Amino acid sequence: AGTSICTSEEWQGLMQFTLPVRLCKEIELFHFDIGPFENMWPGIFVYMVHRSCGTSCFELEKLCRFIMSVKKNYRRVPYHNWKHAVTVAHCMYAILQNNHTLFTDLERKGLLIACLCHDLDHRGFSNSYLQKFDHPLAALYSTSTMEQHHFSQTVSILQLEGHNIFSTLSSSEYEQVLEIIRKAIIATDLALYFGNRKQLEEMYQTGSLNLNNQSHRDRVIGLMMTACDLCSVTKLWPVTKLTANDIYAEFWAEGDEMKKLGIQPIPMMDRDKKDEVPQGQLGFYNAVAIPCYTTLTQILPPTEPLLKACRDNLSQWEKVIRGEETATWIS
């Protein structure tokens, strides 16, 4: 219950944090893995906001409070956690750097913040679960249930004393940025991805795609969100595989709860069906990941490394299916 708030020690600590000089170069690359640098994660986000938006885009005090409170409102779940938030924000940073002038100042600050906040207060349960068992959230939010909650959580944090990083915007720009953030967070509902990608592919293939058209912009931004949300499939194989272990820990825990409620889970969520995982991944790459990064690369050519990496990981899953895997380590 209630919104969690960082301590003075936490935000003042972040204010005084300095990134190691060696990481500056690394952070620009799509394949960068934040994994080995946990103590630096909030600082990495500050650095990214500063590089993309400028050191004077936000009041530093308010920015540091906001970041550390956002961290405090991610739960200790295996996958939809603070690490995932920063990973998604980093992918967006790399996309924005490679495509900087396609996006307005307002959009860049809105999108980096949207990515950091996009899974706020996730409980480790899918929209499917919440609706099946009529959680209060499914009553409140009929579609895109968790995503509407994550937006609500974002607004609650902005409303904490001294946390409104957007207050200095004009009343019109303020409204615009909250709308950018809302649409971006809602777009992370994979249910909406399938139609969005199909629409974009059509607009691209016919040549009607126009980034001066607000609805087109919204859709491109939506696909960017999907691309950043799924970006664990664009890392080096060992990183991708370790992350898959984490998401399946959530899935299996949800399936366990379904069994308690008298219903057999989908196989993906059944910890007694781990043999089906590699084929399940193949399905996910073929149905979601590969088409996403394919269309994104068509629209934003500099994002091609994401697609190349995704393809490499699909090949690795195929190797697993054929029984060609080598030694793997788990945490």
Ligand SMILES: CC(=O)c1ccc2c(c1)OCCO2
């Ligand atoms: C590991 C990862 O990023 C990823 C993300 C979402 C998933 C998934 C894997 O497996 C299939 C269902 O959706």
Ligand code: NI
């Ligand atoms: Ni989500």
Ligand code: NI
């Ligand atoms: Ni996410």
